[PDB]
């Protein structure tokens, strides 16, 4: 069973939704949309392998970013 | 003057500190440290060009991530 490859996929799903909340608001310049297209198909094709839905993983990792930083101390 | 290339650098400084708070806690497997080394020198060498300190940039981008999502509605 894979626990630390599923938490590094759930946090990358949240960090990509933080970057697609930045691109869909037109924050940054034009090369940020160039960088997004290449890695959007790469992050979602990595979802097929370990078998997790990207929208539910963007939400499950949200709790695992928020709570793991209030956890640290 | 560059405003949207400085906000995409301040958010990447915060998102890298979210990934270096993950690597320094031993969260994820060994290839996440392989991926980190390549881009750590790339993110900091990009700091030299636009001329912003990476610790202070990790810091007001935190306010620019937190506040821009409570700002969206």
Curated annotation (Swiss-Prot), chains A, B:
<comment type="function">
    <text>Inhibits post-transcriptional processing of cellular pre-mRNA, by binding and inhibiting two cellular proteins that are required for the 3'-end processing of cellular pre-mRNAs: the 30 kDa cleavage and polyadenylation specificity factor/CPSF4 and the poly(A)-binding protein 2/PABPN1. In turn, unprocessed 3' end pre-mRNAs accumulate in the host nucleus and are no longer exported to the cytoplasm. Cellular protein synthesis is thereby shut off very early after virus infection.</text>
</comment>
<comment type="subunit">
    <text>Homodimer. Interacts with host TRIM25 (via coiled coil); this interaction specifically inhibits TRIM25 multimerization and TRIM25-mediated RIGI CARD ubiquitination. Interacts with human EIF2AK2/PKR, CPSF4, IVNS1ABP and PABPN1.</text>
</comment>
<protein>
    <recommendedName>
        <fullName>Non-structural protein 1</fullName>
    </recommendedName>
</protein>
<feature type="region of interest" description="RNA-binding and homodimerization">
    <location>
        <begin position="1"/>
        <end position="73"/>
    </location>
</feature>
<comment type="similarity">
    <text>Belongs to the influenza A viruses NS1 family.</text>
</comment>
<feature type="short sequence motif" description="Nuclear localization signal">
    <location>
        <begin position="34"/>
        <end position="38"/>
    </location>
</feature>
């Amino acid at each position: 069973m894979d626990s630390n490859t599923v938490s590094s996929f759930q946090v990358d799903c949240f960090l990509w939704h933080v970057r697609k909340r930045f691109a869909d608001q037109e924050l940054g310049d034009a090369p940020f949309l160039d960088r997004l297209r290449r890695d959007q198909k790469s992050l979602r094709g990595r979802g097929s392998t370990l078998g997790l839905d990207i929208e539910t993983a963007t939400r499950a990792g949200k709790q695992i970013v928020e709570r793991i930083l209030k956890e640290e101390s």
